[PDB]
Design a protein around this ligand. Sequence first.
Ligand SMILES: [Mg+2]
Ligand SMILES: [Mg+2]
Ligand SMILES: [Mg+2]
Ligand SMILES: [Mg+2]
Ligand SMILES: [Mg+2]
Ligand SMILES: [Mg+2]
Ligand SMILES: [Mg+2]
Ligand SMILES: [Mg+2]
Ligand SMILES: [Mg+2]
Ligand SMILES: [Mg+2]
Ligand SMILES: [Mg+2]
Ligand SMILES: [Mg+2]
Ligand SMILES: [Mg+2]
Ligand SMILES: [Mg+2]
Ligand SMILES: [Mg+2]
Ligand SMILES: [Mg+2]
Ligand SMILES: [Mg+2]
Ligand SMILES: [Mg+2]
Ligand SMILES: [Mg+2]
Ligand SMILES: [Mg+2]
Ligand SMILES: [Mg+2]
Ligand SMILES: [Mg+2]
Ligand SMILES: [Mg+2]
Ligand SMILES: [Mg+2]
Ligand SMILES: [Mg+2]
Ligand SMILES: [Mg+2]
Ligand SMILES: [Mg+2]
Ligand SMILES: [Mg+2]
Ligand SMILES: [Mg+2]
Ligand SMILES: [Mg+2]
Ligand SMILES: [Mg+2]
Ligand SMILES: [Mg+2]
Ligand SMILES: [Mg+2]
Ligand SMILES: [Mg+2]
Ligand SMILES: [Mg+2]
Ligand SMILES: [Mg+2]
Ligand SMILES: [Mg+2]
Ligand SMILES: [Mg+2]
Ligand SMILES: [Mg+2]
Ligand SMILES: [Mg+2]
Ligand SMILES: [Mg+2]
Ligand SMILES: [Mg+2]
Ligand SMILES: [Mg+2]
Lengths: 117, 195, 63, 137, 110
Amino acid sequence: PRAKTGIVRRRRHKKVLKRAKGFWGSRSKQYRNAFQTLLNAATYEYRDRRNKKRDFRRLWIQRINAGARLHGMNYSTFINGLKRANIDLNRKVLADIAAREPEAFKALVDASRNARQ
Amino acid sequence: AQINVIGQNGGRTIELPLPEVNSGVLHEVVTWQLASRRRGTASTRTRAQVSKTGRKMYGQKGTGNARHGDRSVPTFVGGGVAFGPKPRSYDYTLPRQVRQLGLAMAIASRQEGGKLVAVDGFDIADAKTKNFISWAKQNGLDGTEKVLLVTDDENTRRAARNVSWVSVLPVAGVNVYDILRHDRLVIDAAALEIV
Amino acid sequence: PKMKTHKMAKRRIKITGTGKVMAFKSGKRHQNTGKSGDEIRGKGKGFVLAKAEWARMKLMLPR
Amino acid sequence: MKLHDLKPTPGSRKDRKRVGRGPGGTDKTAGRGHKGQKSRSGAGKGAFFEGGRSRLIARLPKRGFNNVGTTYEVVKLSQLQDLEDTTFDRDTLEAYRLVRRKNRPVKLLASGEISRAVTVHVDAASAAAIKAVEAAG
Amino acid sequence: PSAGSHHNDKLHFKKGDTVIVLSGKHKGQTGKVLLALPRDQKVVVEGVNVITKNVKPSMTNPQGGQEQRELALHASKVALVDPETGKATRVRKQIVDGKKVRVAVASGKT
RNA sequence: UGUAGGCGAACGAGCCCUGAGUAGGUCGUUGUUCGUGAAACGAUGACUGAAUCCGCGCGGACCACCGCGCAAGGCUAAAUACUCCCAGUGACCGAUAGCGCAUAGUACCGUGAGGGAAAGGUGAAAAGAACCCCGGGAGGGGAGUGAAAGAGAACCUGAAACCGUGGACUUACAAGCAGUCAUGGCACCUUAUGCGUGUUAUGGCGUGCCUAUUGAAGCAUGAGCCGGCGACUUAGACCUGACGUGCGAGCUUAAGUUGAAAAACGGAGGCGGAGCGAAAGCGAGUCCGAAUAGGGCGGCAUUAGUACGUCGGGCUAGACUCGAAAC
RNA sequence: AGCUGGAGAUACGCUUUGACUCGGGGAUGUCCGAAUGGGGAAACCCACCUCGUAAGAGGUAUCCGCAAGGAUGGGAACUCAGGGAACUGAAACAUCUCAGUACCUGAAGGAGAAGAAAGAGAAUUCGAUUCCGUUAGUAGCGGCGAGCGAACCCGGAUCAGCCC
Ligand SMILES: [Mg+2]
Ligand SMILES: [Mg+2]
Ligand SMILES: [Mg+2]
Ligand SMILES: [Mg+2]
Ligand SMILES: [Mg+2]
Ligand SMILES: [Mg+2]
Ligand SMILES: [Mg+2]
Ligand SMILES: [Mg+2]
Ligand SMILES: [Mg+2]
Ligand SMILES: [Mg+2]
Ligand SMILES: [Mg+2]
Ligand SMILES: [Mg+2]
Ligand SMILES: [Mg+2]
Ligand SMILES: [Mg+2]
Ligand SMILES: [Mg+2]
Ligand SMILES: [Mg+2]
Ligand SMILES: [Mg+2]
Ligand SMILES: [Mg+2]
Ligand SMILES: [Mg+2]
Ligand SMILES: [Mg+2]
Ligand SMILES: [Mg+2]
Ligand SMILES: [Mg+2]
Ligand SMILES: [Mg+2]
Ligand SMILES: [Mg+2]
Ligand SMILES: [Mg+2]
Ligand SMILES: [Mg+2]
Ligand SMILES: [Mg+2]
Ligand SMILES: [Mg+2]
Ligand SMILES: [Mg+2]
Ligand SMILES: [Mg+2]
Ligand SMILES: [Mg+2]
Ligand SMILES: [Mg+2]
Ligand SMILES: [Mg+2]
Ligand SMILES: [Mg+2]
Ligand SMILES: [Mg+2]
Ligand SMILES: [Mg+2]
Ligand SMILES: [Mg+2]
Ligand SMILES: [Mg+2]
Ligand SMILES: [Mg+2]
Ligand SMILES: [Mg+2]
Ligand SMILES: [Mg+2]
Ligand SMILES: [Mg+2]
Ligand SMILES: [Mg+2]
């Protein structure tokens, strides 16, 4: 029994070409380069999914020391004062949302600063 | 679990071999038989010598194209297959006690459900097919099941062979696959059913 | 079919036993011999160890 | 059965090795390494410096006897059995060999076998249990 | 290249035989066999109306015509009829000499 | 139209003698497993050259005995091989497949011997588009035919590269393996108002692929792009292992024979059952040897074998595919 | 009862005193070709002898034989025979193998070969030849290396021995 490739190959090809649809030039329309661009695409995907936490952690911290210094403390001293009172265990992201609500942030700043004295 | 026909109606023996081996033995048997009937006719152009061709196509180097030397190569379109089919005999001897145990398990898969036995009692006139339909229809063979009959008198089989739901099987030439195949079995009783 | 390399037929390979490969002792056979007497009495029949698989197919039929 | 319910016994048929066929299994090179004589068949079995070579002491013929132990024999419960005749119907397979008996376990009860050859002690444990043993005369 | 007679260049109708159509839009219409083309399996009966068009051609005339014509058909008409229409055909009955194999359904001729 | 069945032809093919220039020999040589080996025998080139039935040739140097056989005259069916050709059939191909050819050893290449292609598809049926329009045309638009003209003869489908037309979002201080995550702007809502689809701006991040490599983004190899052909196979009474099945101290056939819409018979033969020895040969013992020290081996664990199937390896043969310069 | 080749196209017509088409024989059958009257660059040149009106017909090569009458050439693979490779393996390479393979050439048929024991062989058995299974990779041959490899017994297919 013969069994030519036929419909199989072209199914696979169209799948790849359909993953690759934002892409520039023949990264979008030829298979070979489509599949090749997707190789590095997989690398970059799997990297960023756990690096994105690094970036967002940066953005949280970076937003926290801004209000810290806005009041005349700073990130290192302010989280050391929110740690020196045991009871503050909220994530930095929630300290950011508080940095978007100045009154509560200042309440935590005076709380923290009443713990390094 | 056995009765006959118009002739007599006395039980032979209900004894069956092993209980039907759930495909552990029946499967290899029908597979071997389908292989044994199978013929090996599948030629294909030889990876070289069968094709019609000549010599070295062009120069070994400095032509500036891929290194090659004949028109009859499997990577060439022109044909000659690497690893194509050739005639071969798939037949082999299944050891005999497996053939016998297989037929016995087939009959045993017939008894604990869909088998029937017959002396004669055919009451077939001039091998008329119509009388055959009547005779079997009184026995519940109303054409809503597949049928394998095994007789030896050429008149009754000559009556039956044109029905779409029955097939005729002469003499001892019984087939584990023919009876696994149909959904009913009717046996001469007078022949292989006894010793 | 198969064959057995005829060199192994009468050579220091005895398939006999539980499938193991007895073999001769070699050093100083019929070349010069003017040395130790308990050495020259020590060229008879011992057996090999990490080669046996090759010798079997040398002569599975045990000639 | 109905035949589309047929299945061969589990593990009675393993599939093939599709050596080749890419990165999910056994890829670029098949099982073969990188280079060397893993290319197209040829070499067989020899180290290709030296043969492992030893001397040869040499002879050409032999002629064995067919074997008949007396331990399988004592269990027979039907003695006075002729060699060729009454042994052919219960094994003793070779047709172009001579028969003989060995002294494997105890003869016990009396018998009268007519073997083509016998060990010197088989007459001991045979006639000691009253038993004529007739070699061809 | 495929001969078109799986019917062995046999024909169940003579030329001029009255005939009824089994199938197509002409089923149940009536007609004598004007032309019988065995090997091609083509059958002409009056009433298979077809509107062939041509005044492009010069040979008949510088203009020409649309015109009504026959369209020959497959042996998919009933070959022969009777006061009962359609139906099969027994043969081998004898003529007044018996040298003519003839036709019958239930009974009759031609 | 056939099929089962039945008929079917004037002419038609087909069941005292019994082999001499020889047997034999020497010299050169050779065939069977026969490579001068202890080399018999046949076989012939050269030179020679017997015997008759109380006779001749052979029995693997040679001899005696003991056996087989009568050479130097001829003919002889069948079983055996092939397949230009015919039928039948197919876990064979179905237009790059399959023969090279859906026909063609043509076209074409060669002074020549010789090499050597692509192949196809309206439609049910031609009803194969009257007639009108723009155009010399070609091509096209109407009309009709037709079920379909989303079939119209560049006539089944009509994928991809590749070329265009139109619309969303976008783009002219930008540095860039072409992406990845995130946030915003615009568009849209038929697996779809969402943890949405398309696009996009900015931020961060980020050395094509394969190969060959100590080491590859490499300025190391291959590759214009899409399609499609394209490489670990087959064989065998083979050896070896794993798994499974039948039977099991036993297990099984081969060639074939008789049947075949089906398989049974077929024990010749193979493997297990005893080993040691260089072998004669002994034999659960055996070889070495002058008797005692060992080697292999059985007891003991008696480890159960064998016929198949599948699969891992091995062999032998193109043996994973392509590729020499040569002979 | 249609036919008038593919071929699809018109015209001309043939057929129920039987067409076509299908089976069977007959009869014509230009020239080349074994080519064969002679020549020759195949398919074309040039002759001679009898019939004899002429158009037209027949003969005119060589080999075997008195004489009939044979033969020459062709044929896909198969057969036998006269010659007879080398790559290659041997991890080099001379003996060896590759192999009596490929190839050339001759003879022939639907087959051919071979064949009716001055045999195999070791039981005082067998009883023509060919072919399959097996004996068996046993014997054995081999720079005793790579490797090369029987036969008898036994089982089948087919079995006839006739003539000088
Ligand atoms: Mg990344
Ligand atoms: Mg280039
Ligand atoms: Mg081809
Ligand atoms: Mg031994
Ligand atoms: Mg794997
Ligand atoms: Mg590689
Ligand atoms: Mg390397
Ligand atoms: Mg080779
Ligand atoms: Mg080898
Ligand atoms: Mg016009
Ligand atoms: Mg000589
Ligand atoms: Mg030599
Ligand atoms: Mg083709
Ligand atoms: Mg194509
Ligand atoms: Mg060709
Ligand atoms: Mg031309
Ligand atoms: Mg056009
Ligand atoms: Mg269109
Ligand atoms: Mg279309
Ligand atoms: Mg057209
Ligand atoms: Mg269609
Ligand atoms: Mg199309
Ligand atoms: Mg700008
Ligand atoms: Mg730029
Ligand atoms: Mg990288
Ligand atoms: Mg380097
Ligand atoms: Mg590069
Ligand atoms: Mg380049
Ligand atoms: Mg063989
Ligand atoms: Mg097992
Ligand atoms: Mg021990
Ligand atoms: Mg196995
Ligand atoms: Mg493996
Ligand atoms: Mg291996
Ligand atoms: Mg090559
Ligand atoms: Mg026509
Ligand atoms: Mg001439
Ligand atoms: Mg001439
Ligand atoms: Mg070499
Ligand atoms: Mg050489
Ligand atoms: Mg040849
Ligand atoms: Mg020849
Ligand atoms: Mg000839």
